RNA sequence: AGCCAGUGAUGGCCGUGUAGUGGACUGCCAUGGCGUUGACGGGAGCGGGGGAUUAGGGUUCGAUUCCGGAGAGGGAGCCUGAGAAAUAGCUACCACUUCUACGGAGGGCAGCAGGCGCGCAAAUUGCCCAAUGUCGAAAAAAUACGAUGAGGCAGCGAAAAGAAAUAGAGCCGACCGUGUGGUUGUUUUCAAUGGGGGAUACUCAAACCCAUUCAAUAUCGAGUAACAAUUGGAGGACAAGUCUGGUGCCAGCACCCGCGGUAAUUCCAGCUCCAAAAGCGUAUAUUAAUGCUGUUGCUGUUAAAGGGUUCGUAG
RNA sequence: GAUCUGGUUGAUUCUGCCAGUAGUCAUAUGCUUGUUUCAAGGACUUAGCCAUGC
């Protein structure tokens, strides 16, 4: 039948969003993201480099 | 190999002329029997008037309710299936409106595990569905 | 001229004023304030225009 | 409604749109060259593709065609005036061995760092947007320029500007009416 | 000019004419024809299959536009 | 798969009508003309110059600004003109329609702007003859201003197209990795510039927008730059989490493969990240992908496909 | 730029189609929008019906 519909949205708990500062835009932030993967990080000759890696918790 | 004249162009011509209706997306291009068949007379989106809200079963390996709605058409009243999407957004619907219908990929096969569905809803009451589901409207 | 002092226009010399009076156009004279004085609306002219079609005399 | 002006497109997508290798390679030449979008880059893209289409087409007429010496001639002209190609290759060859970075060191964006008169290549893309660079006493405010071969000795700060002989700017004259 | 195919008529004939068309696609050929019937004078005796030159004139009937000259 | 001839079909002879030739038409005569090299009939459709996609060959679109043709609700006749079988000319009939004193008289936006309806779907009931031209008994000036919704100008307008802001340099701690050189916040100066507003004013036919300029004795202004960037995604194709809560084959996602039955890499959310960016999703049609229409250039023993075998005309 | 990838099996090599991908002065709808230049704009359906002014 159609009793149960949208259960699931209307079941999970509110829960706001941060406040943060502005991150610059334009080409403000091109400059930014060439400076976050090609420098501030030494690894170099290894081209081991991870955009996203997530700290350990697999329980 | 096959005919290699330098006066034979009438045969090649008609040789390429039979073939072609062989492929069914030539031929439906040129044919005219799809268009009348069509709900839609080859348009992208039409306009109709809900009837009342079902729920259709999902194909066999999966197993869910896909609330769908039965909808007449207003340009040739002609009576269809369409699909809501997103959580909730049936109570945005109700009985005797107004809504919005375009295809759902694929020009007119049925999609996923809905049977024989072919449809979406897109706006009731001319507002916007992905509207009323992201709060950005109030329905009128 | 774009990001500049320079500016560049047309210029005419006549040899007399009444020479000026009588080939300048009427706009231009207004500018310096002694062109004619103004004319009617254009739309109540072509409304009498046809008005006085239904009349003779 | 009955016009006759004229307007065409000067970039393209690329086909196949996330492959690693070419997204590494676009985001390098951005943030070393200061650019704002991709666009910049695939404008260059074009603008290369055309010549090296042309030059195609004429390499495979014979030598002594009267298009391809009046033609071949052209484009070299264009290509040595403009800065692509030193004076010392000549055979015509040396266009479809032209590279991105070639089309992008004549950028007045970078012969303004080159040059010294920027402490980097955003400050200088700041500099040039603000009125203060003057290529032959013209003010030019357009990063794109493609600074031409007779032009680079030539390049300075402009008279209007306050860092040369200009008026105070924004800061000092709101400090003195403070 | 062209071949003289019927001569049913009175001081008419008809002349058939056979050229090749080019199919840009295919590269080829192909054989093509036109019918023409003209005023043939009694000066001339064509027998079917022979040769004729033919000018143009005045419209002399609702499809005669063409005069013989010289038949070989 | 046959078409054309009483009542013109193909040709001939004197004629008539036209501006003129002609079967355009009257009388008489002959029996012709077209067709598998696709006639006759049916379907879609205004032609072209050209647009989109482009190794090459091609496929597709073209109502629309230039050229040609046709029409003025439906369909026929005709006067005046050198020229019309004219729609802001006339006459009648057919469908809808306005005023009236009930005797009668009118109306034709597929011209301009505007309304109803139809639909997925499309702008102001604006100003001007300054420019470009046409018409004219006209050059402009005066005791004396030709018309012109052709035409041009501005309002609305992410169809689409071209440029391009949303910050640049450093200071002092806290640091991060690597081996002392970029870097990641915390305090804090120091210049520069335009969104914004105003003219001695330019433009303008008059207004608007650009372009100049914040003294030339003499002219306002970013610092949690609250002047605050979004739209889609993060299992694979396909760039990007073995993160944390909720649900429990339900609710839902999923273009395709699939995910969800208590530890969900896929649903609903928070935090990070990725793409491209004043743009970005969805639907339908179409081009390339497609050597899946093959002339260049396909396949036919078994995957779809060689006729049961010979003769044979056009080709 | 003369380019391809996911789905038939316990695995393999094929034929083959579904799905992905890039455009479109190509239309429509959704979300979001500071500056400037150039611009198409009741063809698509109903050559449907029209108040008022020119
Ligand atoms: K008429
Ligand atoms: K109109
Ligand atoms: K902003
Ligand atoms: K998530
Ligand atoms: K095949
Ligand atoms: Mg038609
Ligand atoms: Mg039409
Ligand atoms: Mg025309
Ligand atoms: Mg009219
Ligand atoms: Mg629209
Ligand atoms: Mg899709
Ligand atoms: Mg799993
Ligand atoms: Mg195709
Ligand atoms: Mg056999
Ligand atoms: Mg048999
Ligand atoms: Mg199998
Ligand atoms: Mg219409
Ligand atoms: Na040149
Ligand atoms: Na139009
Ligand atoms: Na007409
Ligand atoms: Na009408
Ligand atoms: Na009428
Ligand atoms: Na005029
Ligand atoms: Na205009
Ligand atoms: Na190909
Ligand atoms: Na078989």
Redesign the pocket.
């Known amino acids: 039948?159609?009793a149960?519909?949208?259960?699931?949205?209307?079941?999970?708990?509110?829960?706001?969003?941060?406040?943060?500062?502005?991150?610059?835009?334009?080409?403000?932030?091109?400059?930014?993201?060439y400076?976050?993967?090609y420098?501030?990080?030494?690894?170099?000759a290894g081209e081991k480099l991870?955009?996203?890696?997530?700290?350990?918790?697999?329980? | 190999?096959?005919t290699?004249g330098q006066?034979?162009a009438?045969?090649?011509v008609?040789?390429?002329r039979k073939?072609?209706?062989?492929?069914?997306?030539?031929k439906?291009?040129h044919t005219?029997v799809?268009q009348k068949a069509?709900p839609?007379?080859?348009?992208?989106?039409?306009?109709?008037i809900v009837l009342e809200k079902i729920?259709v079963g999902?194909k066999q390996?999966?197993?869910?309710?896909?609330?769908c709605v039965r909808v007449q058409?207003?340009?040739?009243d002609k009576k269809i299936i369409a699909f809501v999407?997103?959580?909730?957004?049936?109570h945005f619907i109700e009985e005797n409106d107004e809504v919005?219908v375009?295809?759902?990929?694929?020009?007119?096969?049925?999609?996923?595990?809905?049977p024989g569905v072919?449809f979406?809803i897109?706006?009731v009451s001319?507002?916007?569905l992905?509207?009323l589901?992201?709060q950005?409207?109030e329905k009128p | 001229?774009?990001?500049?002092?320079k500016?560049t226009?047309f210029g005419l010399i006549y040899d007399d004023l009444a020479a000026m009076?009588?080939?300048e156009?009427?706009?231009?004279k207004?500018?310096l304030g002694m062109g004619?004085?103004?004319?009617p609306?254009?739309?109540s002219?072509?409304?009498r225009?046809?008005?006085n079609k239904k009349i003779r005399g | 409604?009955?016009?006759?002006?004229?307007?065409?497109?000067?970039?393209?997508?690329?086909?196949?749109?996330?492959?690693?290798e070419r997204?590494?390679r676009?985001?390098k030449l951005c943030g070393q060259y200061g650019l704002?979008?991709?666009?910049?880059i695939?404008?260059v893209?074009m603008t290369?593709?055309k010549m090296?289409?042309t030059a195609r087409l004429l390499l495979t007429l014979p030598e002594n065609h009267p298009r391809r010496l009046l033609e071949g001639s052209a484009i070299m002209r264009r290509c040595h005036g403009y800065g692509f190609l030193d004076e010392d290759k000549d055979k015509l060859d040396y266009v479809l061995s032209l590279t991105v970075p070639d089309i992008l060191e004549r950028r007045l964006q970078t012969v303004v760092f080159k040059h010294g008169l920027?402490?980097?290549?955003?400050?200088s893309?700041?500099?040039?947007?603000?009125?203060?660079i003057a290529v032959a006493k013209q003010?030019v405010t357009?990063?794109?320029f493609i600074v031409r071969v007779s032009s680079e000795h030539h390049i300075a700060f402009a008279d209007?500007?306050?860092?040369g002989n200009?008026?105070?700017?924004?800061?000092?004259?709101?400090?003195r009416?403070? | 000019r062209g071949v003289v195919?019927?001569?049913?008529?009175?001081?008419?004939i008809?002349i058939r004419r056979?050229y090749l068309h080019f199919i840009?696609?295919?590269?080829?050929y192909?054989?093509?024809?036109?019918?023409?019937?003209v005023?043939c004078s009694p000066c001339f005796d064509p027998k079917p299959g022979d040769e004729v030159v033919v000018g143009q004139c005045?419209?002399?009937?609702?499809?005669?536009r063409y005069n013989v000259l010289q038949v070989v």
Request: proline share 5%; aromatic share 6%; with cysteine.
């Open positions: 039948s159609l149960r519909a949208g259960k699931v949205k209307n079941q999970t708990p509110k829960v706001s969003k941060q406040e943060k500062k502005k991150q610059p835009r334009g080409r403000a932030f091109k400059r930014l993201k400076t976050q993967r420098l501030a990080k030494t690894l170099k991870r955009m996203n890696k997530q700290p350990p918790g697999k329980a | 190999t096959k290699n006066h034979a009438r045969k090649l008609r040789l390429r073939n072609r209706w062989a492929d069914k997306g030539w439906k291009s005219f799809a069509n839609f007379g080859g348009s992208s989106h039409a306009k109709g729920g999902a390996p999966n197993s869910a309710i896909r609330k058409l207003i340009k040739n999407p997103n959580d909730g957004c049936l919005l375009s295809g759902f990929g694929r020009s007119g096969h049925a999609v996923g595990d809905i072919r979406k897109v706006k001319s507002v916007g992905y509207a589901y992201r950005k409207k | 001229k774009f990001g500049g002092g500016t226009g009076k009588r080939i156009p009427n706009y231009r207004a500018r004619k004085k103004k004319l609306a254009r739309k002219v072509k409304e225009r046809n008005r | 409604m009955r016009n006759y002006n004229n307007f065409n497109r000067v970039w393209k997508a690329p086909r196949r749109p996330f492959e690693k997204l590494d676009e985001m704002r979008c991709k666009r910049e695939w404008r893209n290369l593709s090296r289409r920027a402490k980097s290549v955003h400050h893309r700041v500099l040039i947007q603000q009125r203060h003010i357009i990063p794109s209007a500007s306050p860092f200009g008026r105070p700017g924004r800061v000092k004259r709101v400090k009416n403070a | 195919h019927s001569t049913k008529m009175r001081r008419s008809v056979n840009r696609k295919y590269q080829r192909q054989k093509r024809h036109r019918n023409i019937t005023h005045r419209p002399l009937s609702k499809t005669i």
